[PDB]
Subunit: 73 residues, 2 copies
């Protein structure tokens, strides 16, 4: 009945460091006529994704750590 | 008939800086039993997405520029 998903953002909320070690995927997109702020979408290991910080600026470090965690090639 | 998408990666190839200013979305995911390397997926403005560098390490700068391009709040 009532509405809980309209002119809000990319998600009701977001995490600054979703189950990091679990983060098995990520999705960053700019804001729109409501999100009023960039937002991302990270997936975890096991089957559980969601929306994360705005480009994880404060968590960027831990993020750059997740992005640089592919130094196995 | 022939197969062109098997034990390869997240995409046939990837861009180090897809239509950046157009990049209207992004998706970063780790490699698997074939990609042998982290890969991402960025979308452009107009309706055209694809796979980008591996966390755009060399292009990370221009990327951090796209991630920090939300300083309008």
């Amino acid at each position: 009945a009532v509405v809980a998903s309209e002119l809000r953002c990319q998600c009701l909320k977001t995490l600054p460091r979703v189950d990091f070690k679990n983060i098995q995927s990520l999705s960053v997109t700019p804001p729109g006529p409501h999100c009023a702020q960039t937002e991302v979408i990270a997936t975890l290991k096991g089957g559980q994704k969601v929306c994360l910080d705005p480009e994880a600026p404060l968590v960027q470090k831990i993020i750059q750590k997740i992005l640089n965690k592919g130094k196995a090639n």
